[PDB]
Design a protein around this ligand. Sequence first.
Ligand SMILES: CCC(CC)Nc1cc(C(=O)O)ccc1N1C(=O)CC[C@@]1(CN)CO
Ligand SMILES: CCC(CC)Nc1cc(C(=O)O)ccc1N1C(=O)CC[C@@]1(CN)CO
Ligand SMILES: CCC(CC)Nc1cc(C(=O)O)ccc1N1C(=O)CC[C@@]1(CN)CO
Ligand SMILES: CCC(CC)Nc1cc(C(=O)O)ccc1N1C(=O)CC[C@@]1(CN)CO
Lengths: 389, 389, 389, 389
Amino acid sequence: PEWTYPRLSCQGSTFQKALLISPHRFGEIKGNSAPLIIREPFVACGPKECRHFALTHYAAQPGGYYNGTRKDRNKLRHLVSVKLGKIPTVENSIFHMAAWSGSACHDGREWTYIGVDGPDNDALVKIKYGEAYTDTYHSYAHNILRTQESACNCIGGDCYLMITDGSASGISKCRFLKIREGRIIKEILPTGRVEHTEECTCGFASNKTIECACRDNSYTAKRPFVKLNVETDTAEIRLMCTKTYLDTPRPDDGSIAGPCESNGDKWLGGIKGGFVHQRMASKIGRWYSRTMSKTNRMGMELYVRYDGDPWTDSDALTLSGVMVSIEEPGWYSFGFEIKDKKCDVPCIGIEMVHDGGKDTWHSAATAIYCLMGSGQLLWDTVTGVDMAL
Amino acid sequence: PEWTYPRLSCQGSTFQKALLISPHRFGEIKGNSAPLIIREPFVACGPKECRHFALTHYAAQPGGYYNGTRKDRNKLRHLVSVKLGKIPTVENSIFHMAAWSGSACHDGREWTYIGVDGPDNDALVKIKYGEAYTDTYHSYAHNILRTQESACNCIGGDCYLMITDGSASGISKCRFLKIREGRIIKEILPTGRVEHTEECTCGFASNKTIECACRDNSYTAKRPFVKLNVETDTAEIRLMCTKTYLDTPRPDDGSIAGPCESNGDKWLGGIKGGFVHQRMASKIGRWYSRTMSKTNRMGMELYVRYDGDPWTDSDALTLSGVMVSIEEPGWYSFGFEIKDKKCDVPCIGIEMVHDGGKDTWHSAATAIYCLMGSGQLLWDTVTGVDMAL
Amino acid sequence: PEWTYPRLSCQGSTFQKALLISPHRFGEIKGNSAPLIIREPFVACGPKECRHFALTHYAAQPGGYYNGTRKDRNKLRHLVSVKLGKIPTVENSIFHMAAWSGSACHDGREWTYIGVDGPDNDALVKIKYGEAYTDTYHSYAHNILRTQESACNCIGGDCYLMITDGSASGISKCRFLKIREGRIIKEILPTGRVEHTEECTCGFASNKTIECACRDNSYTAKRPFVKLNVETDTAEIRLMCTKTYLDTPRPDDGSIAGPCESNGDKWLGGIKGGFVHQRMASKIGRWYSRTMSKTNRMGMELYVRYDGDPWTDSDALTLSGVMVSIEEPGWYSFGFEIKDKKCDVPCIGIEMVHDGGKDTWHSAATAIYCLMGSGQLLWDTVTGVDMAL
Amino acid sequence: PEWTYPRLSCQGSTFQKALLISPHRFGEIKGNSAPLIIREPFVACGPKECRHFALTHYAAQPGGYYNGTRKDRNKLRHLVSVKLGKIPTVENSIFHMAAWSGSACHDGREWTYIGVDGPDNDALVKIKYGEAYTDTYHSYAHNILRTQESACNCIGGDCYLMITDGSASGISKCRFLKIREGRIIKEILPTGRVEHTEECTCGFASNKTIECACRDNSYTAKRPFVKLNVETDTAEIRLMCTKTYLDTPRPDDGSIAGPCESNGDKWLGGIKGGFVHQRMASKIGRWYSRTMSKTNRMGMELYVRYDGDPWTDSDALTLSGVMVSIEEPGWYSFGFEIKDKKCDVPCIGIEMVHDGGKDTWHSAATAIYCLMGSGQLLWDTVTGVDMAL
Ligand SMILES: CCC(CC)Nc1cc(C(=O)O)ccc1N1C(=O)CC[C@@]1(CN)CO
Ligand SMILES: CCC(CC)Nc1cc(C(=O)O)ccc1N1C(=O)CC[C@@]1(CN)CO
Ligand SMILES: CCC(CC)Nc1cc(C(=O)O)ccc1N1C(=O)CC[C@@]1(CN)CO
Ligand SMILES: CCC(CC)Nc1cc(C(=O)O)ccc1N1C(=O)CC[C@@]1(CN)CO
């Protein structure tokens, strides 16, 4: 097998409803199924198959282990996966490794799986290449070492993964692991606005740069934007200048005064946001997704912007459609690309969490929208699940 | 892999009971299975495997989501599939895409999947090639854009699919998409009797023509018959002249006065009908299926006719056997062909719907009859399912 | 792929307990499984995989369709299969075709499946080659056309299958279909003692002959023995002369007076019996299995005999071991051969039916014994299933 | 395919938590799953896939066959397996053969499966190569012939397996079968301290020697250590001299007086212990695991020792970490190696038995730790299962 490289996107000018994976439409006390309790789903694709990954609490619905399924880190959590299209049940899934934070990507020949686990003050990034545990990385800030919760990106056998370490309420300077065949051959230290960068959604803007729309949990509702050079292996970060803030919670659009680099009010918190590229010979399409509600993880909107510099462009992004309405859950979103015969199809996935509190199960559905054809985005996604059943 | 082309049918002069897929013989409240609630099943075959496709309501039996499973369009519906022979349960199936109307065919190298979804007045045909969403088509009449609910037909890498748009009670002029590797390379506008044509069952009459027995829902109990030229890429439609009307409901045979083109009384309504070819060097066998009851979807009969012109032949078709008796359900029927080592085996499938009203689940069984050996058709198919369990 | 031919057996001088497939150890009302209700199991092997075939009543345990699962012929029955080693549940199995009598064999390139179905007075043998229905054969005596319920045997692409037609209480002259790539290229009419021959268990005695130990249901407790010539394509039948009668019920051993050809008392009834060959350069080992109880299908014994002529040898067979004790069920038995790297391993399977009457489910377990190593047969098989659960 | 040979271990200096397979986190009376009741799990890897083997009591949870699932030998037990990562449910697993003691290994081309079964005083080792039963071996001491309960080791197509026969409370002289393509081509009689050696965990110390840390059930808390020469095909056994006794129960470390060969008090009993190698060009790392509690199978500790002679080195092993705390079960442990692209990854598995007495089910979880990266062992494994559900 030969190495994967980003190619031109397939042509299209709009995203449409592609696929909904609602595992819990089969979790009734009356039904006879075993969908796993999961969270932080993401899709990664190899040249031949796409895979629906997720972090399971090692429990099913119906079941008797709902207690604690709303908390994120523990000794039971595992990175699991199914072929995209398959329902993630107890028997359908493959357990890759113990992890309460993960990532995965296909280098063209084999699958690389990233799972972080261990004690908060000394967590560990573990790397698996296919069936073999090949390497690990240690906590540097000693405050919950974590990773992307979305696909890593490989080019010519070299895969780049964002990791971060630090306080959720303070400073978390991220790093980038350059992995090759399962072993870390390099650690990239980004430059610029480094005070807080987590849950980066990365993709190839070209064969020279990898860009990530990330999450700042302590200082702003603006998403830190990473420009990583795959030739010089150097990264530099700074805020997306756009009026259309993509974090949640956030203030009114255009609400933040000052130059591009202004944080504005902290707006304590954030969320992982969808972001994927549309590469054309002439232009670059940057697709973003963000919650409909400014304060809550309800709904999901699609935005596009062709060309410009995310760092210096104060202009608003263009609304491209409602993927999820305000009455449906809109939690984490990510980007991924399906590999078609000659070109790449960009897609955005939306984690639709079923929240009913700490005193009941807590799992998620995954909605998929991909670039296809033209015109306007036509329909939205509902999970269809009734938590009382 | 090299492209698929229609070949001569394998020899035989009769159809026999081949296979019954009754998923709900395992849906008892007492059992431990999860058969999906489906409707509009159809079978399509590649050079190596056949597949049982269907439109699921994203629900199982036993389960708690039976409400609404009798209606056809919604945001939960999906085109799913299993290898033919497998029971379509929650774990066995693969979810291809969101669709409340579909179609699928194998071009010799890859699977093409068609799923239509979106709002009634602006629905959308979406095309998937293997794992990639490759193209889409828009509503032209702005009244529920829909498709076949049966296999599309490929020849040399070119696949033809019938789509229609319009009122069920009025005019619905159908169109034909010429698809290649997932992208629409052409849109064919048929000539002739174009006022209403839906749910076309198409097949190859030869390497030059594709014929479809279709459904007219507003004006007649006679089935519109399409003759599509694969070399000039032009279609022309007009009513089957035969005395033996194949739609449901319909009047007594021979009941309609006038020339071949007479509609007769509207007989509001219709049904998708089975139709498949038997190609011989010398002759063409055209196999049709139609409900036993004239007014209700109960029972299913097999009919044959060798040669002639469906458009100008007023003669009765020859009764070839009772596949389903009047006491068993006989809903949609379709044609498909299994690819044997040197020749093609024509088959007719019958959707056997379990109807018990809107206040209980609504799913279907699929009976298969294929050309094999000679003599007369020997036995019928019962679903064996008791809806009370 | 190149054609299969019988090779020399692997060396050994004894059979040992190999594998037990007890699907109903998982059918408790308390459990969460769906083992299929089956009967008439048999194993057939290709060059690479063996398969556990059976005739399902299209029902599971626990379930609500036990009524009628004790009767043998109906419109719901199907020939199904799983990889040998897999439990035959609703999801594990593949439904091949509708059949209330079957057979199957691998010709070295593809699977051939035989299923007989239709009305008793006009049943039909249907042949499937891989995915394609390729041919059929008709009732000649017009009294339940049936077949082997065990593997057919292929040599150089030619597969021989025994079929029989007629009364169970009278005459049933069997025939032999020579099948090639799914189509009957010849019908062999046996010579000799032809009055009653059913459920023949056949195997290769060499590359020239196929021998079957069969069942006479009307006239004797002696098993009709078939010697079929694969070069001249002619068969001839006559009773096994041995003192050790292998049918059930039967009288005391040596009980029947007269020459080899004497029927003795009718002993109305019979059973399919295990029979497999052990080919050595110098000698031929013939392995037989028969119930421990003379009148009931309880227990199973193993017998061997090297060389001689089954037709003229009045000598007793040698007891080789108790595979099943008198307190466990011992119903149908068959032979099959696993293909090892250079040689063939002969095995005998025993259908262990769970009978509790007509007012509860009726299914079976399958025990496997194969030639391996030397010494004496060491342990027996119990199903372990409690029918009350 | 070409034969497997041991290669250099991948680099690393520590073990980390890799994967937990807790099948019973899905066995609730409320859930809808069927995890098998198992014991004596072990992992073996081929060049491309690893497999989770185990000895099932042919029963599931929830189910109604818990009675007797705490005893080890019977006619229902079977050696089963799933791909490592898959949950061992009724449908996921493959039943290889009837065995109440087993072993398995991949020679580079095919799977070899060892299962011992039969009556205690005349048990039998049966060998299966892929699908074929190829050979068997007999009881020599006529007291429960048994084997490893962990992977056998192949080199150049030759696989070595330890078997033992004898009293658990007295003498059990072990033997070593040299197997090739399923048939025993040689029986090795070890020299030295031969009075009691069972459940040997073996691995390749190099291409010349296979070393096993084994179990002495009658005379000491010191583990018998086997040095087997693959070139001369001779074995020799004697006690590990180390202060750090690895059996359970055992006295305080350094507690046993006398020279390396002193037994000390019998400390009636024992346990299978984990042991795997870390081959470097220059040095050999020997990894051992042993229960945390001296008297009970609670907890599991990791120990290492580079170079030296296990037979003459009285020094303590180095504590390398707590894999399981004293409050969690720590039963059998074994070693295995995943084959990475160029090197081998050593791992230790821990069987975590769910014991609640004889009056409820008795099954196990399997925790995996593998060499990866450096630093110290970071986290422990909990099963997470509540036996009351
Ligand atoms: C901003 C990072 C915070 C705090 C550290 N982590 C976090 C937040 C959320 C959420 O719902 O916002 C879900 C999961 C996590 N996660 C954790 O708590 C550990 C890693 C993981 C992802 N960051 C995944 O479980
Ligand atoms: C004559 C077409 C009508 C009305 C538009 N559609 C329709 C009818 C029936 C039926 O039972 O007759 C089932 C499904 C549909 N379908 C729909 O309602 C949308 C497309 C689909 C097939 N035509 C499949 O769901
Ligand atoms: C001696 C043949 C008899 C009577 C015709 N058939 C028969 C007998 C038994 C039995 O338990 O003995 C089981 C199945 C059948 N079978 C049938 O009733 C139809 C074919 C099949 C096998 N002979 C399999 O279902
Ligand atoms: C020290 C060997 C003893 C006594 C013979 N056997 C034994 C002990 C234990 C245990 O929990 O210690 C489990 C299983 C067995 N086993 C048996 O009883 C038969 C073989 C097998 C492994 N030795 C596996 O079932």
